[PDB]
Curated annotation (Swiss-Prot), chain B:
Protein name: Spike protein S1
SS bond partners: C24-C49, C67-C120, C79-C213, C168-C176, C226-C278
Gene that encodes the chain: S
Immunodominant HLA epitope recognized by the CD8+: region residues: 136-144
Documented effect of changing A258D: In strain: Alpha/B.1.1.7
Reported effect, T166K: In strain: Delta/B.1.617.2, Omicron/BA.1, Omicron/BA.2, Omicron/BA.2.12.1, Omicron/BA.2.75, Omicron/BA.4, Omicron/BA.5, Omicron/BQ.1.1, Omicron/XBB.1.5, Omicron/EG.5.1
Effect of mutating F144L: In strain: Omicron/EG.5.1
Source organism per UniProt: Severe acute respiratory syndrome coronavirus 2 (2019-nCoV)
Length: 49, 295, 282
């Protein structure tokens, strides 16, 4: 049970990691940068997750 | 077999921001009785304030306004580090001389806009106030100068301009004229010579945080339903329900063991709601073989 | 005014010990019955901080850097200290900051200040209707080019004479993060003869100030030349460091325990296992 707990917990904690982007939350990214400049950081985040 | 996944879509969006109350008197230069000279223009320092541009623009209570680089309806969700207000009185024919990258009588020698200027220009008809019987000589303007002023430069100094080379000292000689002249304001003249109050809004953007921004609109609160919620700090989707949790006075939102936000406090009023994401799951199909039946 | 005090002697920075001091709420997030570990500018446990006091021929006001962050601890009955002097050049050349309590509320001003050689405060002509209100401000003569102003929440102060043990503890943490000046405050009653009491307490945020000016040094206001003596007061000055604490949240959100990770070899295991109880093993 603890290894499963650590695995589910790890899978949830990876959403909080920044993964090289400006922020881990996608709504501030879509609300600030233009779509062509924005697509490079969102692809870096999807590929990281 | 699992053929798909289902999710409940949100009915609407809810956006609530904290109160804008205890506003600063940003309209002091707008409602001011008398300004200074075009070369004497005063700059209002606005810091740690919130300015409402809706009653300044959408109400259409003024004569005219003109924007540069940004729409007047986009100023609510956008803002920069600092905001200034330059109050001065000019004539009707000099209204067109106020613009970035443009040259003119008062543009080069009095007040000049930078090429990157993102702000706006606001004007209204002052003829019912600034005009009086016999003329108002209180306001002055610099007609002649030997050089051009830098953008956003204020020089109130007085002198005697010399067109040619003459030893003019304290007198008016040949090729020696007074650089400062008085307006000819009279109520009987047409709209071209009527005095207009032009207050230009100067925006400044630096590495410092932005302490001055536009108004913040809020919406109604709905409970026990799946909605898209944004309260001032974050975006998220879930079902809002009042709970028994207790927050400390400085705590805006809170998170669970997964570092996901399970609760948020209203930035406007005082209420504590748990955040439960909307229900979803997989679609399971119970069917016999194709050769048995279609149920 | 120009000449200094005859009894002025700069003391060396002697050290004393602190136990649980430096624990504070890193953010406004509310978590309950969990152990969270964060990395920010912190005050290490069991460290050495300066031990300073001033009486009616011992006078100490050294100059210390505010660079890595500075902790303030003041144990006083009547809350004598109104505020501190903050700034880079500490004069009108650059912007300086002053947090001053006027006994009504907390006053914050950022301006260009002309520095006087001998600042001080006091009350004059109290014979009729005393009230112990501030009369004249002699600390700074002039102020100009003010880029910022703020007034904080109302607080309560009673300067009436009291008897017995020290009734108050003021624990302050001042810091600069990306221009935000974060003011942390905690106030609790204690029974203390001398030194520091045994106990654990968390420091609560007051205000987050978005000024964004650089401050390389700080000073303490002188509040009470041979016949003018200082009052009885004591203060402590710590230094924040990028440490890591393991915070223990109770059911109400208050921190009941803290473990400094790199302090002790057992505590690196406490932060590794993410628990306040270490099980037997390697």
């Amino acid at each position: 049970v603890n290894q499963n707990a650590q695995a589910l917990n790890t899978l949830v904690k990876q959403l909080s990691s920044n993964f090289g982007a400006i922020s881990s939350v996608l709504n501030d990214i879509l609300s600030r940068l233009d779509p062509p400049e924005a697509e490079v950081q969102i692809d870096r985040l999807i590929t990281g997750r | 077999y699992q053929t798909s996944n289902f999710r409940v879509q949100p009915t609407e969006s809810i956006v609530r921001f904290p109160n804008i109350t205890n506003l600063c008197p940003f309209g002091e230069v707008f409602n001011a009785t008398r300004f200074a000279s075009v070369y004497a223009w005063n700059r209002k320092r606005i810091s740690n304030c919130v300015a409402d541009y809706s009653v300044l623009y959408n109400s259409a209570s003024f004569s005219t306004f003109k924007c540069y680089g940004v729409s007047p309806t986009k100023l609510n969700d956008l803002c920069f580090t600092n905001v200034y207000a330059d109050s001065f009185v000019i004539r009707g024919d000099e209204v067109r001389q106020i613009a970035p990258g443009q040259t003119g009588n008062i543009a080069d020698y009095n007040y000049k806009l930078p090429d990157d200027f993102t702000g706006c220009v606001i004007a209204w008809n002052s003829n019912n106030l600034d005009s009086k019987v016999g003329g108002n000589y209180n306001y002055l303007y610099r007609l002649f100068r030997k050089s051009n002023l830098k953008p956003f430069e204020r020089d109130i100094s007085t002198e005697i301009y010399q067109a040619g080379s003459t030893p003019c000292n304290g007198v008016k000689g040949f090729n020696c004229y007074f650089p400062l002249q008085s307006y000819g304001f009279q109520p009987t003249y047409g709209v071209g010579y009527q005095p207009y109050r032009v207050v230009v809004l100067s925006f400044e953007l630096l590495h410092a945080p932005a302490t001055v921004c536009g108004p913040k609109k809020s919406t109604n609160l709905v409970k026990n339903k799946c909605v898209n919620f944004n309260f001032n700090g974050l975006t998220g989707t879930g079902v809002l329900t009042e709970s028994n949790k207790k927050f400390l006075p400085f705590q805006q939102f809170g998170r669970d063991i997964a570092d996901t936000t399970d609760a948020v406090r209203d930035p406007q009023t005082l209420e504590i709601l748990d955040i439960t994401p909307c229900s979803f799951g997989g679609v399971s199909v119970i069917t016999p073989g194709t050769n048995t039946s279609n149920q | 005014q120009c000449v200094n005090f005859t009894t002025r002697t700069q003391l060396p920075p002697a050290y004393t010990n602190s136990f649980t001091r430096g624990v504070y709420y890193p953010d406004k997030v509310f978590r309950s019955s969990v152990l969270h570990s964060t990395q920010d500018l912190f005050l290490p446990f069991f460290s050495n901080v300066t031990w300073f006091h001033a009486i009616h021929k011992r006078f100490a006001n050294p100059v210390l850097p505010f660079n890595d962050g500075v902790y303030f601890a003041s144990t006083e009955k009547s809350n004598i200290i109104r505020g501190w002097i903050f700034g880079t050049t500490l004069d009108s050349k650059t912007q300086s900051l002053l947090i001053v309590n006027n006994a009504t509320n907390v006053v914050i001003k950022v301006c260009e200040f002309q520095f006087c050689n001998d600042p001080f405060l006091g009350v004059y002509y109290h014979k009729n209707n005393k009230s112990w209100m501030e009369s004249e401000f002699r600390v700074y003569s002039s102020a100009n080019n003010c880029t910022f102003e703020y007034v904080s929440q109302p607080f309560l102060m009673d300067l009436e004479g009291k008897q017995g043990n020290f009734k108050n503890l003021r624990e302050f943490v001042f810091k600069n993060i990306d221009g935000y000046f974060k003011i942390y405050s905690k106030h609790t009653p204690i029974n203390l003869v001398r030194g520091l009491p045994q106990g654990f307490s968390a420091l609560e945020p007051l205000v987050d100030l978005p000024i964004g000016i650089n401050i390389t040094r700080f000073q303490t206001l002188h509040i009470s030349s041979s016949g003018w003596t200082a009052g009885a007061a004591a203060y402590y000055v710590g230094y924040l460091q990028p440490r890591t604490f393991l915070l223990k949240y109770n059911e109400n959100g208050t921190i009941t325990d803290a473990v400094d990770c790199a302090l002790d070899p057992l505590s690196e295991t406490k932060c590794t296992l993410k628990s306040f109880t270490v099980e037997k093993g390697i």
